């Protein structure tokens, strides 16, 4: 019985690492997109004010 308990816990842990790995790259991608919109701000604003 203890062998199967170990197997189940190990599989759940591996799934947890995979989910964290996906979350980190999604975070980086969202941060970069926000930075890109932030640069777009001033050029659009300059054209509008002129």
């Amino acid at each position: 019985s203890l062998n199967r308990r170990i197997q189940l816990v190990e599989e759940e842990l591996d799934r947890a690492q995979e989910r964290l790995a996906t979350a980190l790259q999604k975070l980086e991608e969202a941060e970069k997109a926000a930075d890109e919109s932030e640069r777009g701000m001033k050029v659009i604003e300059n054209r509008a004010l002129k």
Binding site: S1, R4, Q7, L8
Partner: protein, 45 residues
Amino acid sequence: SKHLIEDLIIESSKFPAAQPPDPNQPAKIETDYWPCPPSLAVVET
């Protein structure tokens, strides 16, 4: 009918053991000695 000695032995042979199981004890499926892994919902809760 007309023999009451050994038909009770026949009735005793129906269970997996020759004696009926204890009502207090759980079944073989829920006793956590089953070889097949359980479902995700039960192990999560």
